[PDB]
Amino acid sequence: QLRRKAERETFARRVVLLSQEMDAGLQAWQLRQQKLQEEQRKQENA
Amino acid sequence: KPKLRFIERAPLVPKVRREPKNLSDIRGPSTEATEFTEGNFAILALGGGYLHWGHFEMMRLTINRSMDPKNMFAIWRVPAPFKPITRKSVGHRMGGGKGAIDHYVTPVKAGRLVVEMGGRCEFEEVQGFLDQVAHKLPFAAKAVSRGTLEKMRKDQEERERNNQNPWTFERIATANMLGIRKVLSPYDLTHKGKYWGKFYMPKRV
Amino acid sequence: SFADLGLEPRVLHALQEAAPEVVQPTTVQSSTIPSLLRGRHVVCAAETGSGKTLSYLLPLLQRLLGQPSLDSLPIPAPRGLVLVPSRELAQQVRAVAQPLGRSLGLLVRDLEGGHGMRRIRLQLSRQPSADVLVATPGALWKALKSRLISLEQLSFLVLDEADTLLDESFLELVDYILFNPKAQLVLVGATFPEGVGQLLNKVASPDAVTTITSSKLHCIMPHVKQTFLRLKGADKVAELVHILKHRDRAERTGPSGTVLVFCNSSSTVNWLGYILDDHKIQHLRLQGQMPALMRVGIFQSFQKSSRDILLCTDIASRGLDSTGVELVVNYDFPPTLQDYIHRAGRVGRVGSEVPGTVISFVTHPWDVSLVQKI
Amino acid sequence: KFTRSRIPEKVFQASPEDHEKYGGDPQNPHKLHIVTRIKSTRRRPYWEKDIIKMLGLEKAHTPQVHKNIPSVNAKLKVVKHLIRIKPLKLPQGLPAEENMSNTCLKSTGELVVQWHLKPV
RNA sequence: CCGAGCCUGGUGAUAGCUGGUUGUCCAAGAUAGAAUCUUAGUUCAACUUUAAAUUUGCCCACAGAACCAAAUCCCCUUGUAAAUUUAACUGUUAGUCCAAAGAGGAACAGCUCUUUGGACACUAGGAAAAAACCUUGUAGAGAGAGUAAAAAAUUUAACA
Ligand SMILES: [Mg+2]
Ligand SMILES: [Mg+2]
Ligand SMILES: [Mg+2]
Ligand SMILES: [Mg+2]
Ligand SMILES: [Mg+2]
Ligand SMILES: [Mg+2]
Ligand SMILES: [Mg+2]
Ligand SMILES: [Mg+2]
């Protein structure tokens, strides 16, 4: 029973870490797109 | 000339260099000489192989034996024996390559038309002679008129379009579904599960 | 075929003159000719006398057609060069080149040691400059040291008997000859021993290799029958005399009995030739110790097939393209299996069509060659 | 010549009839996928054998899971013929540290918020 | 026992030839080439495996890789864990079979001979029996349970 508990905690920790990774990846992709758009907008001056 | 020309055993110009007998020249359904060519009836090759001057001469003898030159003309569409198949010395040490050439034979794949017949004659009267020739033929064949080949093609198209299977040979094979790629042939994407080696399975819908 | 190479009307007419011995390019010739016409520096190992010289020359003629005549100014060196290891091979190459260049504009010349340097360094030989020049390494090195020739004007180099040109006696003179490095280099041979090929890698940069026939030990020609000598050496020459008696049958039928004898040593060749001439055999001997004029006369006679029996030293093992070669006796088996195969390919040099007979004597040092015979 | 062989992109091209036949939608994809072995590690590519090793599939007929990234997608599709995947859903929220213990996997896709001891 | 008497010493003679070579328990660990009076053996050759010293590998994505088909190589990320020099010994190299690719011979053969991929000389269940086909891999006990591969199908000649 403790073994099953430990395996369950393992699967939960893995799922949580993967979820945080996916969320941060989406946030980073949006931030990179926003930075690219801002640089493209600021590269058309002077 | 409403008669079948004689096929020589070898051409006047010979083949100086030795060459191999590749099964791939008879493997697969042939595209050239597949339909009727100035003919209303012929024999479609239902299989692959090589026909020599012996099979061609037997066919010519069986044709000229029973034909009416004023009503039925026959022209052999296949070429003369040209591919050199050799044989080594009898009682020679095993292995060690190839000797001189033995005999010539022209290879024909599946679907080739052999002898085009035409004139004032239908395929129904010559059906018996064509069936005797086909049973005596080197490879498997089928005596088909101009409309019989079209009827067979329409039947095959109907069988293909009326399929009810939840899984098809291409549907698992071209997908490489369940590891049949551990046994699937590299050329298997071409026959679509219809040509297996030297036998030709047109009956598979 | 040959028309796939885009031959010139002079080249096409010369190829038609080569019929019925040339009706289409050979498969090895097909592999060699247009890649050389693509200008790629390469080396080709194939059958001796298989038209490989013609395959190299046709692309060389096409490349020389794209070259200006302004580089052909006086005092300079040629742009098209060929190398041979023997004066006889160089003479045969020059004779073959002079037939094709009769209908062309390329000037063909030959250079070798032991000959008249006044004619070699003549005003219409060295100073007027030629398009095609086949040269021995010694005469070329002497000319370059004496400033009778140059090396910056070359544009297309051919190395015939390149494996023989890779000899330890022959490598140093070739390296001394090695010079604009951007010229198109083509090497021709029968086979490539590995320890010399990396030597080519000393002066190579992304080259190409064209190999013919079996990639294994292509020891046995399918058109050549071979035998193993199951007898001691003591009567073997007598057995060779018996073979000469068998060659007597070959002398009877008119089926040509041109016999080429392989002898390892020039003095041994001289002793065997004195024995054979004593034995009432029409034998002529060529060796590296023979006089240059005597060797030239003997080579002309063999080209005319005047002497049905001819002995050859280590100078004359490979590269031979002799018409009517029907009898080949390794009186001495070659010390190299490559040398034995090259002597074998020297006979029947018309191609896979002209047949011939091969008999090789077996001695004790050649006992280990019996495994090579396997 | 057996090899890791090319397969068409149409194998990963879904259909609206397929998305109805499956339980999937074109929008809002799965957040994490699950995998299992139901085929032998034997009798496939050794490259694919180490691929299943990379998948953490040294057990078999046992559950495992990963984040279904496009790289993970290609890795799974490399060994797809031997393996099975599942839409490793979670209708409730993700497991907080307060609820760190009581979790499980119901094979239709459920991740349990609290697998208590009494029925409904 | 005469094809060269017998015996003792020399003689533990010599051939690379066969065979047999003794109790236990943990860690790792199976097929590439070249020489050789040589294929019944050995040596250069690779792999290992270990001991020490030094930080990225395997799976890949773009570009790229030639003139006379499958493809393959160099190859950012992804997931996952080991990789480079210095050393010691042994040990394989005479592998079998199967799917693909060629060469020979009858396009006979448990025939030959080179490239790719497996397993195989090593467990268990099933195909009737099972070196090779399918599943399955790796440690013990329980008198639970789920599951995998899993027993062949089949018949006809009517006609205006
Ligand atoms: Mg080396
Ligand atoms: Mg080898
Ligand atoms: Mg004793
Ligand atoms: Mg002893
Ligand atoms: Mg022994
Ligand atoms: Mg030796
Ligand atoms: Mg020796
Ligand atoms: Mg030995």
End-to-end Cα distance of chain A:
70 Å
Instruction: Bin the helical content of chain B.
Output: 10-25%
Taking the alpha carbons of the first and last residues of chain B, their distance comes to 41 Å
Main structural class of chain B: alpha+beta
Q: Shape of chain A, please?
A: rod-shaped
What's the multimeric state? part of a larger assembly
What Rg of chain A is obtained from the alpha carbons, in whole angstroms?
20 Å
The number of distinct β-strands of chain A equals: 0
In which range does the helix fraction of chain A lie?
over 70%
Beta strand count of chain B? 9
Strand order of the largest sheet of chain B: 2-5-4
The helix tally of chain A amounts to: 1
Distinct ligand kinds: magnesium ion
Strand content of chain B: 15-25%
- How many domain units of chain B? 1
What class, by secondary structure content of chain A? mainly alpha
Series of secondary-structure elements of chain B, N-terminal to C-terminal: EEHEEEEHEHHHEE
Helix-strand pattern of chain A: H
Q: Number of DSSP helices of chain B?
A: 5
Helix-strand blueprint:
This is part of a larger assembly, with chains A (46 residues), B (205 residues), C (374 residues) and D (120 residues).
Chain A: H1 2-42
Chain C: H1 9-17, H2 27-37, E1 42-45, H3 52-65, E2 80-83, H4 87-100, E3 108-111, H5 117-120, E4 132-135, H6 137-145, E5 156-160, H7 162-165, H8 168-177, E6 184-189, H9 194-200, E7 208-211, H10 236-252, E8 258-262, H11 266-278, E9 283-286, H12 292-303, E10 309-312, E11 325-330, H13 337-346, E12 357-360, H14 367-373
Parallel strand pairs in C: 1-6, 1-7, 2-4, 2-5, 3-4, 5-6, 8-10, 8-11, 9-10, 11-12
Helix pairs in contact in C: 2-3, 6-8
Chain D: H1 16-21, E1 33-37, H2 46-54, E2 64-66, H3 70-78, E3 83-86, E4 105-106, E5 110-111
Antiparallel strand pairs in D: 1-2, 1-3, 4-5
The structure holds magnesium ion (MG) (8 copies).
Chain D binds one RNA strand of 160 nucleotides through residues 1-3, 5-6, 38-47, 50-51, 53-56, 60-61, 66, 69-72, 74-75, 78.
Family (chain B): Belongs to the universal ribosomal protein uL16 family.
GO biological process, one term (chain B): mitochondrial translation
Subcellular location (chain B): Mitochondrion
Short account of what is shown:
The structure is cut from a larger assembly and holds chains A (46 residues), B (205 residues), C (374 residues) and D (120 residues). Chain B has helices at residues 53-65, 127-135, 146-161, 169-173, 188-191, and strands at 41-45, 49-52, 72-76, 83-86, 101-108, 115-119, 141-145, 195-196, 199-200.
Overall description:
The PDB classes it as ribosome. The entry lists the keywords 39S mitoribosome, ribosome biogenesis, ribosome. Chain B is an alpha+beta fold and 205 residues long. Chain B has five helices and nine strands; from the N terminus they run E-E-H-E-E-E-E-H-E-H-H-H-E-E. The N and C termini of chain B lie far apart (41 Å). In chain B, 24% of the residues are buried. Chain C has helices at 9-17, 27-37, 52-65, 87-100, 117-120, 137-145, 162-165, 168-177, 194-200, 236-252, 266-278, 292-303, 337-346, 367-373, and strands at 42-45, 80-83, 108-111, 132-135, 156-160, 184-189, 208-211, 258-262, 283-286, 309-312, 325-330, 357-360. The two termini of chain C are 37 Å apart. In chain D, the strands form two sheets. Chain D has a three-stranded antiparallel beta sheet with strand order 2-1-3, with no helix packed on it. Chain D has a two-stranded antiparallel sheet with strand order 4-5. The radius of gyration of chain D is 17 Å and the shape is globular. Chain D is built from three helices and five strands, in the order H-E-H-E-H-E-E-E. Chains in contact: A-D, B-C, B-D. Chains A and D meet through helix 1 of A and loops of D. Chain D binds one RNA strand of 160 nucleotides through helix 2 and helix 3.
